[PDB]
Amino acid sequence: VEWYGPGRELWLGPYSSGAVPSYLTGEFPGDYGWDTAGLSADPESFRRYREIELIHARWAMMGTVGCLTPEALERYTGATFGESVWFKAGAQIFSDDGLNYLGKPELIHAQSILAIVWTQVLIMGFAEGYRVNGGPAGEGLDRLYPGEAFDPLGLADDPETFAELKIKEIKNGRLAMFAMFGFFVQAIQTGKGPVECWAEHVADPFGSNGFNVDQMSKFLF
């Protein structure tokens, strides 16, 4: 096909022949043959890295959406968040009114960071224990693609469509991981939110670009 097997699409296009590791045979989703460092030579380490990459991809997609949503709502809509910027959103818990969802005092209206931290650690501990072990939402199933309770719409029923959807998921997750790394670097250098950066760039693409005197005078703060 196009995403699996020897005739798939590789990570260097025409110049990939000879740079493809022998253990990357196009069996798993997102197999572009990019293992120049040889970190996934061991099959056990390979599947550990696949699990880590997929979890990172899903977390990064969720984080990209949740970082773009508030700042976009503040600038391009009448929403009035206390701190719409993603890297300054955690600081509202130290403010007078705390975290207000959508800016309304009547939603959540957090005041203590202690309850937030415990509740989160307890909930995520149970969730991750269930992910690695199984629980109320499934006992067996794959560690990366459980399905059943996590595939209610039944989109992953045809094996070919399942493989294509896995390719789409891993590619979108890698794109979101790249975007989240970009968010980190822009926050460190520019100090302003991704939506603000995008608006400034589309305003003056040649002037307000990344090659700036102050934006490049320091390496990672």
Partner 1 sequence: EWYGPNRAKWLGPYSEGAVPSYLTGEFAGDYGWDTAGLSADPQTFASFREAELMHARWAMMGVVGCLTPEALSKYGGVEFGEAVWFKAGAQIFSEGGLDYLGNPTLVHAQSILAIVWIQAVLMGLCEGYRVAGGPLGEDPGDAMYPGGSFDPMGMADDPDTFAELKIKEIKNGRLAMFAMTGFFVQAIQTGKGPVECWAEHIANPFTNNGFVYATKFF
Partner 2 sequence: VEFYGPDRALWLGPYSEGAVPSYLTGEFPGDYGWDSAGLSADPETFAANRELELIHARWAMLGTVGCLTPEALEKYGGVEFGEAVWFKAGSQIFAEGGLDYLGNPSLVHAQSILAICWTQVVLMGLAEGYRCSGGPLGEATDPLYPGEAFDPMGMADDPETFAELKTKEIKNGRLAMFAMFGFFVQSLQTGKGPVECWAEHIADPVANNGFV
Ligand X SMILES: CC1=C[C@H](O)CC(C)(C)[C@H]1/C=C/C(C)=C/C=C/C(C)=C/C=C/C=C(C)/C=C/C=C(\CO)C(=O)CC1=C(C)C[C@@H](O)CC1(C)C
Q: Which tokens in the block code for residue 97?
A: 């009114």
Residue 174: name its binding partner from ligand X, ligand CHL, partner 1, none (Cβ under 5 to 8 Å by kind). Answer: ligand CHL
Nearer to ligand CLA, 11 or 87 (CB): 87
Q: Which residues contact 72 (CB under 8 A, 6 or more apart)?
A: 195
d(C-alpha 18, C-alpha 15), whole Å:
8
Q: Is 105 in the site for ligand CLA (CB under 6 A)?
A: no
Q: What minimum distance in Å lies between the beta carbon of 217 and partner 2? A: 23
Q: What minimum distance in Å lies between the beta carbon of 192 and partner 2? A: 24
Q: What minimum distance in Å lies between the beta carbon of 119 and partner 2? A: 14
Considering only residues 137-156, where is the footprint of partner 2 by CB under 8 A? 143
d(C-alpha 67, C-alpha 76), whole Å:
15
Residue 70: name its binding partner from partner 2, ligand CLA, ligand CHL, none (Cβ under 5 to 8 Å by kind). Answer: ligand CLA
Residue 12: name its binding partner from ligand X, ligand CHL, partner 2, none (Cβ under 5 to 8 Å by kind). Answer: ligand CHL
Considering only residues 44-73, where is the footprint of partner 2 by CB under 8 A? 44-49, 52
Q: What minimum distance in Å lies between the beta carbon of 42 and partner 2? A: 5
Q: What minimum distance in Å lies between the beta carbon of 40 and ligand CHL? A: 14
For the chain, what is the HEC assignment? CCCCCCCCCCCCHHHHCCCCCCCCCCCCCCCCCCCCCCCCCCHHHHHHHHHHHHHHHHHHHHHHHHHHHHHHHHHHCCCCCCCCCHHHCHHHHHCCCCCCHHHCCCCCCCCCHHHHHHHHHHHHHHHHHHHHHCECCECCCCCCCCCHHHCCCCCCCCHHHHHHHHHHHHHHHHHHHHHHHHHHHHHHHCCCCHHHHHHHHHHCCCCCCCCCHHHHCCCCC
Binder of ligand CLA out of 24, 54, 99, 167 (CB under 6 A)? 99
Site residues for ligand CHL per CB under 6 A: 9, 11-15, 32, 174, 216-219
Site residues for ligand X per CB under 6 A: 34-37, 39, 56, 59-60, 62-63, 66-67, 86, 89, 177, 180-181
Site residues for partner 2 per CB under 8 A: 42, 44-49, 52, 93-94, 113-114, 117, 128-130, 132-134, 143
